[PDB]
Design a protein around this motif. Sequence first.
Motif, PDB file in Angstrom:
ATOM      1  N   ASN A 157      11.987   4.613   0.881  1.00  0.00           N
ATOM      2  CA  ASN A 157      12.654   3.408   1.352  1.00  0.00           C
ATOM      3  C   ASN A 157      12.172   3.216   2.786  1.00  0.00           C
ATOM      4  O   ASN A 157      12.711   3.808   3.705  1.00  0.00           O
ATOM      5  N   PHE A 158      11.132   2.414   2.964  1.00  0.00           N
ATOM      6  CA  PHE A 158      10.435   2.384   4.245  1.00  0.00           C
ATOM      7  C   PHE A 158      11.346   2.107   5.449  1.00  0.00           C
ATOM      8  O   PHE A 158      11.233   2.783   6.468  1.00  0.00           O
ATOM      9  N   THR A 159      12.220   1.106   5.339  1.00  0.00           N
ATOM     10  CA  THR A 159      13.099   0.717   6.445  1.00  0.00           C
ATOM     11  C   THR A 159      14.025   1.877   6.838  1.00  0.00           C
ATOM     12  O   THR A 159      14.236   2.132   8.032  1.00  0.00           O
ATOM     13  N   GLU A 160      14.534   2.593   5.829  1.00  0.00           N
ATOM     14  CA  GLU A 160      15.412   3.758   6.030  1.00  0.00           C
ATOM     15  C   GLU A 160      14.687   5.027   6.434  1.00  0.00           C
ATOM     16  O   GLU A 160      15.202   5.830   7.235  1.00  0.00           O
TER      17      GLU A 160
ATOM     18  N   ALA B 263      15.299  -4.335   2.680  1.00  0.00           N
ATOM     19  CA  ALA B 263      14.817  -3.046   2.180  1.00  0.00           C
ATOM     20  C   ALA B 263      13.359  -3.207   1.779  1.00  0.00           C
ATOM     21  O   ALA B 263      12.930  -4.300   1.397  1.00  0.00           O
ATOM     22  N   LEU B 264      12.616  -2.112   1.838  1.00  0.00           N
ATOM     23  CA  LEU B 264      11.194  -2.133   1.516  1.00  0.00           C
ATOM     24  C   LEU B 264      10.813  -0.875   0.724  1.00  0.00           C
ATOM     25  O   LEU B 264      10.355   0.108   1.298  1.00  0.00           O
TER      26      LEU B 264
HETATM   27 CL   LIG Z   1      14.257   0.530   2.756  1.00  0.00          CL
END
Ligand SMILES: [Cl-]
Length: 401
Positions: A136-139, A388-389
């Motif tokens: 989860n790139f953003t996280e 999210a990403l």
């Molecule tokens: Cl994310």
Amino acid sequence: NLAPLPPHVPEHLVFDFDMYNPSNLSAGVQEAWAVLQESNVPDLVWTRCNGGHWIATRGQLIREAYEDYRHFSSECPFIPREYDFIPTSMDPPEQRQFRALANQVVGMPVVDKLENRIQELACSLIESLRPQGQCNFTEDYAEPFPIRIFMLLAGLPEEDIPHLKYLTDQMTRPDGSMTFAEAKEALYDYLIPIIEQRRQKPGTDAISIVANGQVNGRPITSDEAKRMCGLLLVGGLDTVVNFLSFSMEFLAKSPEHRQELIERPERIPAACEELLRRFSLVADGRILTSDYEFHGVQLKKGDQILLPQMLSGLDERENAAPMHVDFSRQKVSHTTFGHGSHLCLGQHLARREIIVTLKEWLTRIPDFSIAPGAQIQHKSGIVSGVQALPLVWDPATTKAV
Ligand SMILES: [Cl-]
Ligand code: HEM
């Protein structure tokens, strides 16, 4: 939710754009805001959304208004009218003292000093993710990276990260636990004792520097120091988290652009600048200090005006084919970091975070995509962003280095 049109505003200038809910959002945030630049839309419009406010829609007027702080004051920089961080809400001359101090903590020389710490942090995050084939790139990266950079800058222990991330989240995505003003004080309560102690036993860190600072020939007050330190934290979070997300979303969707940067890593600094233009994300405002005729439009004392930093670089009058991402653009024109006396103090730190991210990610995980089936959702506001990403890759095509 339309506020009645003030009598000084002519009807022909009214376009009810909602900065928190633009109608073309599903097309992408920058695309949604670019509707303001369609040829039937004046350079300066009034929207009845969000209490009612002006919007400057073109780079020329946005730049001019940011330059003219005597007419366009930072005393109320957010729409709607209804936040005590320094120097955000100060005009010159008061602003310059606090700005000079904050520049001591994030200025070019500090960035040059922390450069390889910044790289080591990126490598550590990426290496921990690499074997999973997904994140989860953003996280998992976009947030841990700048917050870890802040902990290094501010000389703060790693164990405090989860709690600090939570407090900063309450200002963007509240749990319902407390008012915005409670999230602010919680943050200040975390910061005050650290400030007070480092007045007495200073380190080389950002809190020490700010705490031992001088304004008006006297030591900085604890109230001033806390409000400055607070901006140094939140200022380098939401913007960076969301900007890296836009950039990685684009790269995930454009294997040709990934390939370009893989084959030509020397273009990465230029790529950074072009991404900053294309995926510009801040839309702050100002308040009129007096009645003022501006490009044939009567503005009234107390009117708010949104001056989207995002829009200048997207303006076809500033860059040809503005929606097109081209890393070799001879001249990348934008106001992504703002313009005038509030121009981002973090601009050099942000560029290094972006460049280091691009280099280390493309080195270790050159081939990655959006998760199959995933539709990326965006959000619009003062700092627009990515909800999210989800990213995926084949770990057999990666390398540790
Ligand atoms: Cl994310
Ligand atoms: C992609 C990253 C970033 C973007 C797009 C960005 C954008 C901006 C913009 C547009 C402003 C001016 C707002 C206005 O005039 O109303 C600003 C100010 C500021 N930024 Fe950033 N920023 C970024 C990263 C950072 C980072 C990493 C830091 C480090 C803490 C930081 C610290 C600050 C500070 C302290 C100010 C206040 C300057 C003043 O009021 O004099 N920024 N930023």
